Amino acid sequence: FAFQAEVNRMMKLIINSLYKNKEIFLRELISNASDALDKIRLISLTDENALAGNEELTVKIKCDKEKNLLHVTDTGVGMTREELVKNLGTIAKSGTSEFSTSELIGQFGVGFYSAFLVADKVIVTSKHNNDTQHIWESDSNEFSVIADPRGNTLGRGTTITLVLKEEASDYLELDTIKNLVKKYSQFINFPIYVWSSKTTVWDWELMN
Ligand SMILES: COC(=O)c1c(O)cc(O)c(C(=O)OC)c1CCc1nccn1Cc1ccccc1
């Protein structure tokens, strides 16, 4: 059906970004975090205390240069364990490959699959209201999900961790992330921060 139409759009956008410095993974990281924040703000209109777990609506990005990791943390609606298992309808549980999705592909396919332009794995730590906090890890093909051993550390929202390839080590430099976040967040209504350094003290720096 239209599942091939959205897949066609996804191939077009991901390969197009391969010419332009493979930056579409970061634009999608910011855009999807913004939509998740929009979702919980819409819910807070009906629910009185929908923000009781985390009363702030932010996007916070931190680089781990020595560990070669990229963290993007938003305080959006989050995802239940049942929502992590569904993901975007294309990732199966580990060991079950030999056994709608079109709407999930059209919205999240570009963001998920373009992350593997620079990352070997994609790890999702999410905390949704009325559910515990879980960790979800995928190799682009299969996934595995467990409950976070640390418990509820986000209050509410989602942290996307990208285990970057060494090929993409230059993305973790402060001046690189900051210029890229500033470019792709100038139209996001929510405040977006990057863990930056000032001389030496470290603190969140507003980028938009
Ligand atoms: C690939 O990271 C995301 O797309 C993503 C993000 O960057 C920031 C977020 O806050 C959230 C989020 O929690 O939205 C509530 C997501 C998940 C967006 C989503 N909502 C329903 C399905 N998906 C796609 C998906 C992909 C992999 C595993 C699970 C779900």
UniProtKB/Swiss-Prot annotation:
ATP binds at N32, D74, N87, F112. The modification N6-(2-hydroxyisobutyryl)lysine is found at K93. Phosphorylated by CK2. The modification Phosphoserine is found at S97. Glycans are attached at N32, N130. It is found in: Endoplasmic reticulum lumen; Sarcoplasmic reticulum lumen; Melanosome. Detected in heart muscle (at protein level). The SRT pseudosubstrate motif associates with STT3A during translation in normal conditions, preventing glycosylation of facultative sites until HSP90B1 folding is completed. Belongs to the heat shock protein 90 family. ATP-dependent chaperone involved in the processing of proteins in the endoplasmic reticulum, regulating their transport. Together with MESD, acts as a modulator of the Wnt pathway by promoting the folding of LRP6, a coreceptor of the canonical Wnt pathway. When associated with CNPY3, required for proper folding of Toll-like receptors. Promotes folding and trafficking of TLR4 to the cell surface. Homodimer; disulfide-linked. Component of an EIF2 complex at least composed of CELF1/CUGBP1, CALR, CALR3, EIF2S1, EIF2S2, HSP90B1 and HSPA5. Part of a large chaperone multiprotein complex comprising DNAJB11, HSP90B1, HSPA5, HYOU, PDIA2, PDIA4, PDIA6, PPIB, SDF2L1, UGGT1 and very small amounts of ERP29, but not, or at very low levels, CALR nor CANX. Interacts with AIMP1; regulates its retention in the endoplasmic reticulum. Hyperglycosylated form interacts with OS9; promoting its degradation by the endoplasmic reticulum associated degradation (ERAD). Interacts with CNPY3. This is Endoplasmin. It comes from Canis lupus familiaris. The chain holds residues 76 to 337 of 804 of the full protein.
